[PDB]
Design a protein around this ligand. Structure first.
Ligand SMILES: CCCCCCCCCCCCCCCCCC(=O)OC[C@H](COP(=O)([O-])OCC(O)COP(=O)([O-])OC[C@@H](COC(=O)CCCCCCCCCCCCCCCCC)OC(=O)CCCCCCCCCCCCCCCCC)OC(=O)CCCCCCCCCCCCCCCCC
Ligand SMILES: CCCCCCCCCCCCCCCCCC(=O)OC[C@H](COP(=O)([O-])OCC[N+](C)(C)C)OC(=O)CCCCCCCCCCCCCCCCC
Ligand SMILES: CCCCCCCCCCCCCCCCCC(=O)OC[C@H](COP(=O)([O-])OCC[N+](C)(C)C)OC(=O)CCCCCCCCCCCCCCCCC
Ligand SMILES: CCCCCCCCCCCCCCCCC[C@@H](O)O[C@H](CO[C@H](O)CCCCCCCCCCCCCCC)COP(=O)(O)OCC[N+](C)(C)C
Ligand SMILES: CCCCCCCCCCCCCCCCC[C@@H](O)O[C@H](CO[C@H](O)CCCCCCCCCCCCCCC)COP(=O)(O)OCC[N+](C)(C)C
Ligand SMILES: CCCCCCCC/C=C\CCCCCCCC(=O)OC[C@H](COP(=O)(O)OCCN)OC(=O)CCCCCCC/C=C\CCCCCCCC
Ligand SMILES: CCCCCCCC/C=C\CCCCCCCC(=O)O[C@H](COC(=O)CCCCCCC/C=C/CCCCCCCC)COP(=O)(O)OCCN
Lengths: 347, 115, 174, 318, 70, 105, 114, 83, 98
């Protein structure tokens, strides 16, 4: 793919998301979704192979179905109110259709399978862009229509997301599938807090984006797509493994790392509204995510796996390409707990 | 109503012609008469096997250009508006983007049939 | 009344039942063409001649490409028709029975589905008494795509151009 | 009386189709230095009647491998749409007066495409399938170009009503106004009606009769009737759209005579072209429209959008 | 010779004359010897309906005038 | 989530199409222009919660104009009662409803 | 939510204008020039009151002005006007373009007599 | 200018269709901004009365609004009559 | 609501159920996906024409435009899958697992 074509497709993806986030009209929001998907498919298929083709096919099928359901919800809402502005929806059936469509777009359970499948299919850069940006847009739509969200449906899907992410990540060995299930669990947390405080939803989104960017860029730097491939990194660049270990500890929610702040604020906010069973279950279920983060950390940094003989040549050579903002992402994803009251600025 | 009556008349006349064609003449059918035609010899394969489409990309470009012409069709009514300058700018913008699509495909060799 | 709109809606649903039972893409395209023509008729009765003709023309053009693709990519030795397969016939009959049940219930009483409430009365009843004069409101509203709706034209044109670029990039291969 | 008018529109069209068959035979013969049919009747006037009787008394067969349902439907659809295309034509009064009379004809033509596709696929033979795919490609190219050309020409008119076309062409001719679009439209109608040099779906030299290779007796006659009705209808549409005739409301027969004469002239031009030129290849036809007509078509569309505005000559909406 | 083609073209022209002349004659016959009213808009249709109502015979083409107002 | 670039920059990208009481071409009025105008004017500047609590009457009238549910209920009730009455011969339609009158011009 | 109030059939009765669309279209510019005042009053009433029940008197005045206009036409220019609207009536679209002679005769008749 | 002349000579000898297409498109884009009749076309579209001209209630301080259609006040289409 | 809207919504639901229940071919799923947008077009134009929302009449055209953009995307993906595997069967898209 030509660099100019790639950069214009990335610009088109970003333009679709920005159209979604600035539009006050349901038709324009749908147009933004369509533009994002249309420009996102070739980005997935950039490195041509059957796995990438299959991942793009599954992604297209899922997103097209979600867009059809979303447009049906928009039309039904127009039928009963004659309003196009994106506000509280005036029909419960239309609202349920919209909620299920946006959940399918986000990958919330039970609409999650495509997330690990596509992430395994596509490359590391494609997976990074997918997770980050394609979580970014539908969450903005949900925040706009939050006041009419059915709390029962939203919390059911969020709790299912957390459970499914924990269990899948427990079983997996591929790094991209592990990242996909981590994304599912974090989306579950965000949408769980969504009906109460969109500010807390945005805070969780930002912290998750920072941690995911740091982790994916470390994987790109070390060129590791499996556990054993990551087990050789201590013999070439041991600093990358240490940074990955602290980032993994942060993603598990261990204090005083940055990943504790979203969980803490969400639990506080949910308890303010007399929710106790849901926060306790959500907090306890994150131990599965922490377990598979810790299992990944044992192989990479805390223990020394056997290496090979050509690692000597790899020692002799030096990394050429420089990752942009990797130190900033690594610092922001581990050492911003003392800066917690900035969520009022985020408000 | 009138258009429905016209369509019914045309369809009924065609169906009557088919019925007369299939029932008036003497019929004598056997296996050799109704076998498929391949210039006198039995076909090797089947006519339902995949038939490669060397112009598959031009078909998709045709879909997109069909959308473009659908957008352009309401131009005669849009020329009666008071915002003639905005109407002209938008019509020319759409036509220039269609021309740009054609030029991009032509230079990137999307109009060349597969070999 | 003459129930023309209701009859055409029923034929619309039947065509959808066909191509959703999915015998084979040839007959799916046939059913989709029938449904498009009947929908053109429905919206013509409701008032929109330009919209009906446009949707009919667009789907006639689109199903032409689908025929060429199913002749090439999506064909088998014995293509399936509705009576050829047990699953296809079962789905077709299930859809027909559900449509007939809904039609009968709506005609016999004001049928309120589990989702929405429907009243069995005149499509002619729901229409409006008022009239325009010496212009077509639908034609004017569609023609307002250029004076009004400059933003929609921009995003639509960008989407079409990017679609050309994308379909060229996807099929590149190598 | 409406049924009477429908019959008066249908039966003369079929008669004109049969005698167009005869006329094409004789014109091709005299251009090839022959006489053509002159034995069956006085100047061979009973030749179409003999052909029709022979075809409909001959045995029609369904191939063993064919899909009988779509094998039968295709000629029915072809003839039905061929007869239907005539209902909005003003001569000088249309049978059915439509506010959007041009888009109706476009949609019905695009539907008339599928008759040959379904007949070819249903026949279940390789020559039929090859002809069907040639039809697919041809319709792609001519359809896009036809849409844009018609858009520009009607943009010079103001609306989509053929009576308004007559009113527009009261004084001069759209051929004098916009002859380049007229040339490209004539070529596009040749491609649309599958006439030479674009007779690729039924190309006898490469395929043995093409898509209707398995059709015999009556069902073949229906395809022939549909094709010739399309030829005459497209020539009549061209005559109305570009060669406007003077209309007298109190004596409308003069418009009918002028319209018929211009339609016959264009049909004879079709036969003349068939006698004069070789046959295209279908890839060369696709590259002809997209690479030659489509750029000029877009440029002329821009020109005909701008010209009424810059000259303050925008037609009335109604 | 080339004029042996003319009878066939003459028959084809005679066949093509029938539809238009027949339509014109039927339009004048069913509309009281006048042109069939063209109602492309709601205003024209409302005018036709008013003509039907004021005619007193349920035919829009039966036109009434000063002798009918007084 | 929602970045109001349109309001910040004074642009108009889809607000012209959001509602059916806005400027329409040739000043064509909507079916429920009056009801929509009344509801919008009632609910302007008080927020969603107060708009739903206090402008409920205006919204109910707007929805009635849009969907015509109570009107169709009344019409169906009258039709059923009239059919029952003419079934037993207890009602005789007038000639002006039977088509034996001269309507107004 | 209340009872709809409708005027009785007794006060909805008025002398109708029993001419056809062609007759009305023939004497349309003169009608718009002559009975402008009652028509403009009625249109202002309709567009301000937004209620058919509140401008019935203006409608009756409009009918009275129309009848006065047509009686004036009848007493002076019955024949030129009959020829003019007979020419208009023939056309399917009721075109002003095809009757430029009878229109001239009618305008000459009303410019002198009235 | 020599390079441009050579390029146009080569294009006119190899792709006259494309040369003509681009020339016509360029004329279509540029000419309307220079023609003096664009404003006339706008005014003609404005002068068409699709809807009814609802009258204004006279407050006694509207000297520019005619009391009758034939009064000298109001828009004039004398320019359109002789055009 | 009239029965016409009920029929259109039922047709949309039938098309949605058709897409979610694959049989063998990916092309049939694309046909079901195109039918859903046809039903959406019909429903939206019926709603808009009935309420005389004049400016909304341009919405169904944009709906059609992005409909055929999706159809183009699906056809491109289908040709790539067919080139890889020989058939458009959905069973061959199984390399990636959950
Ligand atoms: C406004 C239109 C409204 C339409 C509403 C209805 C359609 C809605 C959309 C589609 C969804 C439903 C489709 C129908 C399913 C019927 C059941 C079935 O499985 O049929 C198989 C049948 C195919 O079977 P086959 O494999 O060809 O037959 C061989 C058998 O295996 C073995 O059979 P055999 O070889 O022994 O032959 C015995 C018999 C076999 O005959 C049949 O099978 C009859 C099929 C017709 C329907 C019967 C119920 O043969 C005949 O009867 C000979 C005559 C056949 C031609 C006449 C067909 C008339 C159709 C109308 O499918 C069809 O016929 C499909 C077409 C149905 C629609 C017809 C109209 C199409 C119009 C196109 C243009 C539209 C323009 C406007 C928009
Ligand atoms: C399905 C369409 C229905 C509407 C039709 C509308 C009119 C159609 C007009 C076109 C006609 C086309 C054919 C033209 C004539 C030439 C062919 C011909 O003669 O065909 C006739 C066919 C001819 O049979 P054939 O199959 O031997 O045809 C060969 C014909 N020749 C020799 C000329 C080539 O007749 C029959 O099939 C029936 C003959 C008598 C046997 C009757 C059996 C009982 C069923 C029918 C009678 C009614 C029973 C009622 C009670 C039922 C319950 C118990
Ligand atoms: C599906 C086919 C049957 C239904 C078609 C629609 C019927 C109702 C139309 C009512 C509205 C109307 O009259 O509008 C007037 C309009 C024309 O008028 P208009 O659109 O200009 O406006 C109405 C008239 N004024 C100006 C007064 C308002 O009719 C049309 O536009 C024609 C629409 C035709 C749609 C055809 C669909 C495909 C049919 C192909 C059949 C071919 C044979 C198939 C079978 C072969 C094998 C057996
Ligand atoms: C320049 C900014 C770059 C960064 C942002 C890029 C975002 C994408 C590019 C967007 C550019 C256009 C944005 C502005 C849209 C203007 C819409 C409207 O407000 O202006 C129109 C004015 O239009 C002007 O004529 C020019 C329109 C734009 C001309 C083409 C610009 C194409 C640039 C975009 C290329 C495609 C890329 C898009 C995706 C990146 C309306 O004028 P008006 O007359 O009152 O309309 C009459 C309405 N009435 C009837 C109610 C009165
Ligand atoms: C508006 C246009 C409508 C269509 C017009 C079509 C015009 C067709 C041409 C009409 C001219 C026909 C002239 C007559 C041709 C045949 C004359 C003669 O040669 O044939 C006779 C055959 O005549 C037939 O028996 C009956 C007349 C058939 C010919 C006239 C056909 C009339 C037109 C047919 C209908 C056209 C529309 C079809 C639908 C002789 O046969 P026969 O007598 O036995 O032989 C024995 C004689 N012996 C004893 C001396 C040896
Ligand atoms: C009463 C029945 C009147 C005629 C009904 C004919 C239905 C039928 O079974 O015949 C199908 C017959 C072909 O059958 P074959 O397999 O080729 O062999 C039989 C040849 N006579 O098809 C036809 O006759 C055409 C049917 C009319 C088309 C109607 C479609 C609308
Ligand atoms: C921006 C204003 C114009 C707006 C759009 C214009 C209308 C639509 C025209 C654009 C449609 C697509 C254009 C495609 C152009 C590139 C296509 C291409 O690749 O052409 C090449 C390159 O050939 C060329 O020479 C490039 C075309 C150069 C034309 C540009 C000339 C610029 C015109 C300036 C106007 C001068 C005025 C002179 C007036 C003369 C009389 C009209 C040749 O094609 P082949 O691949 O060789 O054919 C297949 C062989 N196997």
């Amino acid at each position: 793919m030509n660099p100019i074509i790639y950069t214009t497709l990335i610009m088109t993806v970003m333009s679709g998301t920005m159209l979604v986030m600035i539009s006050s009209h349901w038709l324009l929001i749908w147009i933004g979704f369509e533009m994002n998907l249309l420009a996102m498919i070739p980005v997935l298929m950039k490195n041509f192979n059957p796995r990438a083709t299959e991942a793009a096919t599954k992604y297209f099928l899922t997103q097209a179905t979600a867009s059809m359901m979303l447009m049906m919800a928009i039309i039904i809402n127009l039928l009963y109110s004659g309003q196009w502005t994106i506000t509280k929806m005036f029909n419960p059936v239309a609202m349920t259709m919209m909620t299920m469509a946006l959940a399918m777009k986000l990958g919330l359970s039970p609409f999650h399978f495509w997330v690990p499948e596509v992430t395994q299919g596509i490359s590391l850069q494609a997976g990074l862009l997918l997770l980050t940006w394609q979580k970014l847009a539908p969450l903005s739509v949900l925040c706009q229509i939050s006041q009419s969200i059915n709390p029962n449906l939203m919390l059911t899907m969020a709790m299912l997301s957390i459970l499914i992410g924990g269990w899948g990540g427990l079983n997996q060995t591929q790094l991209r599938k592990i990242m996909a299930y981590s994304s599912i669990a974090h989306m579950g947390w965000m949408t769980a807090v969504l009906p109460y405080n969109t500010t807390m939803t945005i805070l969780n989104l930002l912290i998750y984006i920072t941690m995911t960017l740091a982790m994916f860029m470390l994987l790109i730097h070390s060129s590791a797509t499996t556990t054993l491939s990551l087990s050789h990194t201590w013999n070439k660049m041991p600093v990358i493994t240490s940074l990955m270990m602290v980032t993994l500890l942060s993603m598990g929610g261990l204090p005083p790392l940055s990943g504790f702040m979203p969980k803490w604020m969400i639990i506080q906010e949910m308890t303010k509204n007399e929710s106790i069973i849901m926060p306790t279950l959500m907090a306890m279920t994150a131990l599965l995510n922490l377990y598979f983060y810790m299992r990944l950390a044992y192989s990479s940094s805390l223990t020394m796996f056997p290496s090979t003989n050509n690692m000597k040549m790899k020692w002799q050579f030096e990394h050429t390409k420089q990752m942009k903002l990797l130190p900033t992402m690594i610092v922001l994803s581990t050492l911003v707990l003392p800066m917690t009251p900035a969520l009022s600025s985020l408000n | 109503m009138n258009i429905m009556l016209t369509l019914l008349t045309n369809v009924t006349l065609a169906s009557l012609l088919v019925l007369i064609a299939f029932w008036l003449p003497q019929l004598n059918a056997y296996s050799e008469k109704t076998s498929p035609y391949e210039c006198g010899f039995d076909p090797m394969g089947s006519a339902r096997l995949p038939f490669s489409m060397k112009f598959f990309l031009v078909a998709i470009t045709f879909l997109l250009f069909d959308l473009e012409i659908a957008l352009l069709l309401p131009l005669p009514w849009a020329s009666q508006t008071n915002n003639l300058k905005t109407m002209l700018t938008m019509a020319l913008f759409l036509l220039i983007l269609l021309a740009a699509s054609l030029a991009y495909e032509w230079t990137q060799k999307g109009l060349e049939w597969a070999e | 009344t003459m129930y023309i709109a209701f009859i055409l809606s029923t034929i619309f649903v039947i065509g959808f039942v066909g191509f959703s039972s999915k015998p084979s893409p040839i007959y799916g395209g046939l059913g989709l063409i029938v449904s498009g023509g009947v929908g053109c008729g429905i919206v013509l009765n409701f008032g929109g001649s330009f919209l009906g003709l446009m949707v009919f023309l667009i789907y006639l053009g689109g199903m032409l490409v689908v025929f060429g693709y199913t002749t090439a990519m999506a064909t088998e030795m014995y293509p399936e028709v509705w009576v050829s397969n047990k699953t296809v016939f079962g789905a077709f009959v299930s859809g027909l029975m559900m449509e007939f049940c809904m039609v009968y219930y709506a005609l016999k009483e004001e049928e309120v589905e589990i989702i929405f409430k429907f009243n069995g009365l005149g499509d002619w009843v729901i229409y409006d008494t008022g009239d325009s004069g010496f212009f077509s409101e639908e034609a004017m509203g569609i023609a307002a795509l250029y004076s009004y709706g400059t933003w929609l034209v921009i995003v639509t044109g960008w989407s079409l151009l990017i679609g050309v670029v994308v379909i060229m990039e996807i099929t590149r291969g190598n | 009386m409406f049924m009477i008018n429908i019959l008066s529109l249908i039966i003369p069209i079929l008669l004109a189709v049969a005698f167009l068959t005869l006329v094409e035979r004789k014109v091709l013969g005299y251009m090839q230095l022959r006489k053509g049919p002159n034995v069956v009747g006085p100047y061979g006037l009973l030749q179409p009647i003999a052909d029709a009787l022979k075809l409909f008394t001959k045995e029609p067969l369904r191939p063993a491998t064919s899909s009988i349902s779509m094998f039968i439907i295709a000629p029915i659809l072809a003839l039905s749409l061929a007869l239907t295309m005539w209902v909005p034509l003003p001569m000088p009064y249309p049978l059915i007066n439509m506010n959007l009379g041009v888009l109706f004809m476009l949609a019905m033509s695009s539907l008339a495409v599928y008759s040959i596709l379904w007949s070819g696929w249903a026949s279940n033979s390789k020559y039929a399938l090859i002809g069907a795919l040639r039809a697919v490609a041809q319709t792609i190219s001519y359809e896009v170009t036809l849409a844009i050309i018609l858009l520009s020409v009607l943009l010079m008119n103001g609306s989509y009503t053929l009576s308004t076309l007559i009113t527009t062409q009261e004084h001069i001719w759209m051929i004098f106004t916009s002859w380049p679009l007229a040339m490209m439209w004539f070529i596009s109608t040749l491609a649309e009606t599958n006439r030479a040099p674009f007779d690729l779906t039924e190309g006898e030299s490469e395929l043995v009769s093409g898509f209707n290779v398995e059709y015999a007796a009556g069902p073949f006659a229906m395809f022939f009737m549909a094709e010739y009705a399309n030829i005459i209808m497209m020539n009549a549409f061209t005559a109305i759209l570009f060669l406007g005739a003077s209309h007298d409301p109190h004596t409308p027969e003069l418009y009918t005579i002028n319209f018929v004469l211009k339609t016959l002239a264009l049909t004879i031009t079709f036969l003349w072209i068939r006698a004069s030129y070789p046959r295209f290849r279908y890839d060369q036809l696709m590259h002809l429209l997209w690479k030659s007509f489509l750029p000029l078509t877009l440029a002329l569309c821009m020109w005909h959008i701008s010209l009424p505005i810059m000259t303050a000559s925008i037609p009335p909406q109604s | 010779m080339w004029f042996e083609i003319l009878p066939g073209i003459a028959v084809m022209a005679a066949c093509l004359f029938i539809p238009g002349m027949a339509t014109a004659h039927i339009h004048k016959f069913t509309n009281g010897g006048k042109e069939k009213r063209v109602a492309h808009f709601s205003y024209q249709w409302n005018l036709m309906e008013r003509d039907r109502c004021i005619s007193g015979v349920n035919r829009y083409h039966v036109t009434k005038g000063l002798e009918n107002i007084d | 989530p929602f970045f109001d670039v349109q309001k910040r920059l004074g642009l108009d990208l889809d607000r012209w199409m959001t509602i059916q009481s806005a400027e329409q071409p040739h000043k064509i009025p909507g079916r429920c222009h009056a009801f929509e105008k009344e509801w919008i004017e009632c609910a302007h500047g008080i927020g969603g919660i107060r708009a739903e609590k206090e402008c409920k009457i205006e919204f109910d009238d707007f929805v009635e104009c849009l969907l015509r549910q109570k009107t169709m209920k009344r019409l169906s009730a009258i039709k059923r009662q009239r059919d029952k009455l003419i079934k037993e011969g207890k009602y005789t339609p007038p000639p002006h409803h039977l088509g034996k009158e001269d309507p107004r011009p | 939510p209340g009872i709809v109030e409708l005027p009785t059939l007794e006060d909805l009765k008025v002398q109708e204008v029993k001419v056809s669309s062609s007759v009305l279209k023939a004497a349309a510019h003169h009608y718009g020039a002559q009975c402008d005042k009652p028509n403009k009053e009625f249109m202002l009433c309709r567009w301000e009151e937004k209620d058919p029940r509140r401008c019935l008197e203006e409608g009756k005045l409009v009918n009275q002005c129309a009848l006065d206009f047509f009686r004036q036409i009848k007493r002076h220019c019955a024949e030129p006007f009959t020829e003019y609207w007979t020419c208009i009536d023939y056309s399917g679209l009721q075109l002003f373009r095809h009757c430029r002679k009878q229109q001239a005769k009618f305008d000459e008749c009303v410019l002198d007599k009235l | 200018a020599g390079r441009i002349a050579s390029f146009l000579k080569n294009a006119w000898a190899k792709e006259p269709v494309l040369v003509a297409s681009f020339a016509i498109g360029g004329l279509a884009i540029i000419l309307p901004s220079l023609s003096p009749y664009t404003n006339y076309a706008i005014r003609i579209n404005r002068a068409t009365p699709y809807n009814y001209p609802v009258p204004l209630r006279d407050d006694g301080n509207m000297p520019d609004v005619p009391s009758h259609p034939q009064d000298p006040q109001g828009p004039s289409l004398e320019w359109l009559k002789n055009l | 609501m009239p029965l016409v809207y009920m029929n259109i919504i039922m047709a949309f639901a039938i098309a949605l159920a058709g897409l979610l229940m694959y049989r063998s071919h990916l092309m049939s799923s694309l046909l079901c996906l195109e039918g859903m947008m046809l039903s959406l077009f019909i429903m939206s134009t019926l709603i808009i024409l009935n309420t005389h929302f004049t400016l909304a009449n341009m919405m169904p055209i944009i709906l059609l435009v992005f409909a055929a953009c999706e159809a183009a995307l699906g056809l491109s993906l289908l040709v790539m899958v067919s080139n890889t595997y020989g058939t458009d069967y959905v069973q061959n898209l199984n390399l990636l697992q959950c």
